Amino acid sequence: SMKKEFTELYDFIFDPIFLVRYGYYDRSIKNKKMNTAKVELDNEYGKSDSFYFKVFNMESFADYLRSHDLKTHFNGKKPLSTDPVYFNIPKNIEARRQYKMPNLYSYMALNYYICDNKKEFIEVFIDNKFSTSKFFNQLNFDYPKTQEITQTLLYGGIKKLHLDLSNFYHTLYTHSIPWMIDGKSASKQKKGFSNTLDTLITACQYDETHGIPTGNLLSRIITELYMCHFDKQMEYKKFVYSRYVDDFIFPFTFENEKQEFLNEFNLICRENNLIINDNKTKVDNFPFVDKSSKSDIFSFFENITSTNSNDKWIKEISNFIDYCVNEEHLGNKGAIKCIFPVITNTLKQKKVDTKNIDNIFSKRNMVTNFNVFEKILDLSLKDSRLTNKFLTFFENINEFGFSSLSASNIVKKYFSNNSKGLKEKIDHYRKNNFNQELYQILLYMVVFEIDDLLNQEELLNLIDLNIDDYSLILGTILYLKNSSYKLEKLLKKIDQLFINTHANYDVKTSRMAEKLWLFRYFFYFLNCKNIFSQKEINSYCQSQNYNSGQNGYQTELNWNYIKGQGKDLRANNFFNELIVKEVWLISCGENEDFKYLN
Amino acid sequence: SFFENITSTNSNDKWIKEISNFIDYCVNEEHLGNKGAIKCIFPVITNTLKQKKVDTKNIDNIFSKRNMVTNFNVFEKILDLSLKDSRLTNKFLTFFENINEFGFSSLSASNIVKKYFSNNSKGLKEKIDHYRKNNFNQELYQILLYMVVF
Amino acid sequence: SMKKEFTELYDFIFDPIFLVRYGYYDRSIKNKKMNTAKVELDNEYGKSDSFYFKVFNMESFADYLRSHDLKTHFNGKKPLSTDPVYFNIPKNIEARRQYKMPNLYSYMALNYYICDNKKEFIEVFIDNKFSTSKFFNQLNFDYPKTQEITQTLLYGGIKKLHLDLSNFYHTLYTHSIPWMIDGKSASKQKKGFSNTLDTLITACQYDETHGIPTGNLLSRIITELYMCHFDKQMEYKKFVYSRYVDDFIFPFTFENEKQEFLNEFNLICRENNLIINDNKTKVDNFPFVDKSSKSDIFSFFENITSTNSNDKWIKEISNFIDYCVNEEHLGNKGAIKCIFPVITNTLKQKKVDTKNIDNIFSKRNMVTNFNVFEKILDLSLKDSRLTNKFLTFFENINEFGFSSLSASNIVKKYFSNNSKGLKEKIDHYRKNNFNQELYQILLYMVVFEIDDLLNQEELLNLIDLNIDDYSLILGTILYLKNSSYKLEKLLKKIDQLFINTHANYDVKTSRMAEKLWLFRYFFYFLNCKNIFSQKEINSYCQSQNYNSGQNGYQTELNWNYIKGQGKDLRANNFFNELIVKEVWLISCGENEDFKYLN
Amino acid sequence: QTLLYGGIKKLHLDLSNFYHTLYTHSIPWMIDGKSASKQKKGFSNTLDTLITACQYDETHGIPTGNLLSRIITELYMCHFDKQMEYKKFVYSRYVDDFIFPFTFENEKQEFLNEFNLICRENNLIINDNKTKVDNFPFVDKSSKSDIF
DNA sequence: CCCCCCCCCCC
DNA sequence: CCCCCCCCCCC
DNA sequence: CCCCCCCCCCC
DNA sequence: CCCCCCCCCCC
DNA sequence: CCCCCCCCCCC
Known part of the structure; x- marks a missing residue:
């Protein structure tokens, strides 16, 4: 039954x-x-579009x-307020979009509350008929199935109204x-499900x-x-439409239907402080346009086979990449995303041999200096939302036989040829808080062993305020990967960052409820396993004249002393429980020395 | 040439x-100015089904299957396409005649059209009233002819 | 000195x-x-664009x-939370804009706090150089002076960037x-000036x-x-621009200046959760366009004199009205607003005699049935933001000699000819919460003695939920103005409204901290002076079987009983102090019988 | 394609x-x-003379x-290209079709100023009709x- | 995971 | 035509 | 020329 | 207010 | 109809 498929998916x-295992980083299986x-x-x-899983x-x-079981940490009535990781990503080539990755403690509080009240969600989702977004791309409810549902919902209509x-x-x-x-008239008299849910959400974003x-x-x-509650209000007024999140597709025939729908939709939006994007409002007349x-x-690759030469491949x-970029320019949404999966699936399905794949992606044409991996890398650098897809594509063809040393040399050569523009780009995103772009550049440098772009000085300039946690981690990893540099300068930079961050807070605020919780966990976890050698931390803190004590050297770099500071230690106790059990949140590679090339 | 790379060895779900993608593609072609593209949908689907040499029971499965999660059926989509333009009534009924000869059961088609009409009864009654007041003869004719046939 | 003019204006x-006397309704002198x-x-x-002063x-x-002195009411630390009057007005022929007229108690709390901390405002305003909005159209800082300041600020620039x-x-x-x-980094540790200001603002909108x-x-x-603090941030980065509220005019010559300005402006907007309207972003190249x-x-009327015939006037x-409507269509902002003041000033300056003015505006052409007052009235009904300007224009020409009885007959005739469309309009704005349009129609009916549009039944349908206070007052006034109807039905409607409104609230919430505070004050003030006869209220409440008591009949209609209900009675005490002293907030006319025709 | 790497925008000049x-x-x-044209007998002067001899001293x-x-x-x-390369710019040229890859508008403006300067020095005229910036995702009609 | 056909939407 | 203000729309 | 895959840009 | 020239922007 | 390739335009 339909109900029973829904129920399976939601349980x-x-x-x-x-x-948490797939939800935190928005992964789908x-x-x-x-x-x-x-x-x-x-x-x-998993399938993810935001953060590199390795x-x-x-x-x-x-x-x-x-x-x-961490239920015991999550029984206090008032949820602890924490700061998330602010991580700004491109919306397009011009605009920006803000992510907020919550403190893991606040995430888990919300997580258990939602799973404890899952029926609040499941009854509405299963009773809902208009949403194609209520499957969250999970299991077998992929794009063609949701389009099937949308097509069924749009029956009977000679016109479509689009609202955003x-x-x-x-x-x-x-x-x-x-x-x-x-x-709304019941907000005026808490303790209910929705009020507590709102409270935990605001706790995830520091009571904002x-x-x-x-x-x-x-x-x-x-x-x-x-x-879906918005949809319930519109359904009680006897309207039928398709919704993906906020994309409303209203099927209709007569203008009175459209006008009555618009009045009702405007009314609910005004009641709930929702604003329509009037730019995106459009009526499409049949015959309907479909640009996607x-x-x-x-079917680009139908007439190529493994008997075709490597040059033709x-x-x-190359022509495929140009064709999909042009398709996306023309309005074919997701065409650029399609490049990597379909190249990988064509290589698998045409059954090209491993050594042939190595030749295809490692060949440098002598006259033209052209290499197709370099073209795909440059395509990925054109949009930082493509970082995960590019690295997954590299992982796949590397499994298919493309050597990792060859890939490293190709990326190194690319980075050397474009070092000046890349350094200007890094400076641009550092001044303007373009977090994902900086993250993409540093992650490529970490993954492909790029150690020539930035010297010690610029690497230490990475460790400063207005840098997101992920970029701070990646820059610190780049610095630890270079054995020539010594650790005192990094310790000084990290200490300065920690003190400056705590200076923005009440002196009774716990460290792990603050900004840079993830970087702090990275640091404390490394120190707990002596990558950050305890002897050299002692040397640094002696150089800074910190007073010793019962737990140690009374610094922002000493988790033994830090875990006990602050009035509310719930987040500190949760993260100390994670640290003691050697639970890592950042993978350090197979051999603990920060190599991700397999 | 939409259907070059599909065969009778392909699954009924892929068919x-x-x-479905074919219908969307031709509707977009007609929107872009390709005159007669929507007319082309029915003859070329029928000729592809004949030429790919799909078996009668496979045709029955293709056009009678209701996907349980999505409630989608491809005959219902084609019927709704035909109701989008009453000049398509004859082409739709000829297409139904052809696939019914190809093995698609007439009782299954009747149930599918009945279900469609029940789900859209309110809008269809408003449509009937519209064409009755405004002398839209072919639209009313198409609705009543579907009610007679199915 | 410049500083000393600023200081005079701000003191x-x-x-x-x-x-409160001019600020509450946004009046300028x-x-x-x-x-x-x-x-x-x-x-x-005063000059106002929102609410009819009479x-x-x-x-x-x-x-x-x-x-x-009402300082004593405003010493409690926690400001009382109240609901404002929600009053939605047209933004244009399509969009809407929400006003929120605060509870007078909350207004006065904010008012005294702001005047007690006026130096916080005045130092910044006087130090500011980019704002042409920091005069609030008061005194002699009118439109040409602000344009003079803007022109000075735009010097040296070959291009203008517009941001909203x-x-x-x-x-x-x-x-x-x-x-x-x-x-922002000092929000994390209250008791300061800006935090208390935020608290009083949210108290004005019910902790929203x-x-x-x-x-x-x-x-x-x-x-x-x-x-102006946004401006201080941009000035410390050495930029020069003109701002009217949120309209930024950036003068620049080279594209690097524009790009650096855009980056800085984007950065501050992202820091403060401000969103740029990307639709309104445009660069203007010299020669500059000026559509205003x-x-x-x-100068439409230069070549007309009082020696010209009344027909030519x-x-x-009429041609003037058409010309300004076309000017506004072409992008001349405020042209329609200009129609009424310049017609009035032309009539005054051309020195047209009172009887000639009476003939100009009272003449009905026999063949064409055309009357120019009816055209101006219909123009005003085309946009409800024009209500005040139309009624001020009527007041002026009525002073100039145009008879008020003739105006009443003209408006009555207009309303009779358009009664069907006007009733459909009233129903539209009632269903869709178009508050200002309904307010304009009812205010014209009140002012020009229109008693034929709506019978008793529709008038009682006016008294219901989702009607703003001002429309509720105007409908109640329309009902009391008709002596044929008896008061029991209105008492029943008003009682139902009051009970239903209190039902949306905690039972310990005071009445005058709730929605419909202004209508409730209107009612209680009328009852205190026996327009709402105490005998007939007793009869109604006997009919409803309310239990009597120490103060009276224990109903929502009895201020004696109502003023003592609720845990926090500060708003009730303030409004009871107003009621006892016969302070009215709604003018009932010169002779207390609700006539505004002079 | 190799020459256009790293650029989020393309400037087309003709x-x-x-x-x-x-x-x-x-x-x-x-x-x-140009300042060495004012004092012949060199390679480029003789080349110019033979070209004009091919078109009747025109x-x-x-x-x-x-x-x-x-x-x-x-x-x-290619000597035009040498001048632009000494100023540290990268672009593709087919005869007179210039494809300038760039990311920030300051790069584009500095390129345009330099290119205008050399064109003015050598009596070369830009076809302002064909000037266009293409944003990624890039259009490819060919x-x-x-x-x- | 297991054992042809895939692959995209949003915020 | 008579004795200021005019003057244009359509088919 | 020799022995699959081609084929187009400019002036 | 008093005693020529005015009149418009925004939210 | 008979025995690969079809299939669309208009009024």
């Missing part, structure tokens, strides 16, 4: 371990058996949860969530009521609940 | 999705 | 009595001597303040006010942190402080 | 009527420096339609895959 999804009871390191079952993942945390909400996630008033769930912490699956689930047909794209792949 |  | 403005120490009723010195004004309250903030007032995060004033309560002068002053020249408009005025 | 209005005495300017334009003209024009344009 899979609404599990705390699922919700296509089969329940992918959710193995072991730590996954060498492969990736460096940043929740596998160790999920393994910890699988055997030990402007800046929906990022300006959503969080106290309007209980209005949508329970009725402006917007929802975007970039994770719990936020998507809460937003979907909000929007992907048939030509996935190279030129065909 | 369903390929036909 | 005039930052006075509590000024800030051109001379300090207009701020008389008496109640103004028959004339209006019905809604603060003159009685200001007279009360002038002799008695989208939905600035209505989506402003109120906790970002202390960020702008003090620095989404947006600023728009439609009054205190909101404009707070928004100007916010924006008003020279032809104010009629036709000239 | 020279108007390049072959047919090329001042032939500007060839020694491009090859040797100094307006280059005799178009043969490979020697293409070689001389390519020498001229795919021949369906055709072949």
